[PDB]
Design a protein around this nucleic acid. Structure first.
Length: 63
DNA sequence: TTTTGGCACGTTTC
DNA sequence: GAAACGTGCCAAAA
């Protein structure tokens, strides 16, 4: 576990839901920006998480 | 264009 | 026996 209990979990949806609701991010994009802060998390984990938290792809919620 | 998923390794605990 | 952590590679579909 490179990160904490959810240093990236409570971030993907926490930051995405706080940015552009009409413009959701993508596991890849979210992972990209997250790597710029200090989560250096792979899209593989970020993709699995967004699904674990309660989000299909942040794309459905927007539409 | 865009987004997502499977499997398993290593680790560890029950 | 199971689950989970993060990351390797591939693919799928629209």
């Amino acid at each position: 576990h490179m990160l904490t209990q959810g240093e990236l979990m409570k971030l993907i949806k926490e930051i995405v839901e706080n940015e552009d609701k009409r413009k959701p991010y993508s596991d890849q994009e979210i992972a990209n920006i997250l790597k710029e802060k200090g989560f250096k998390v792979a899209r593989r984990t970020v993709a699995k998480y967004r699904e674990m938290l309660g989000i299909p792809s942040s794309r459905e919620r927007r539409i």
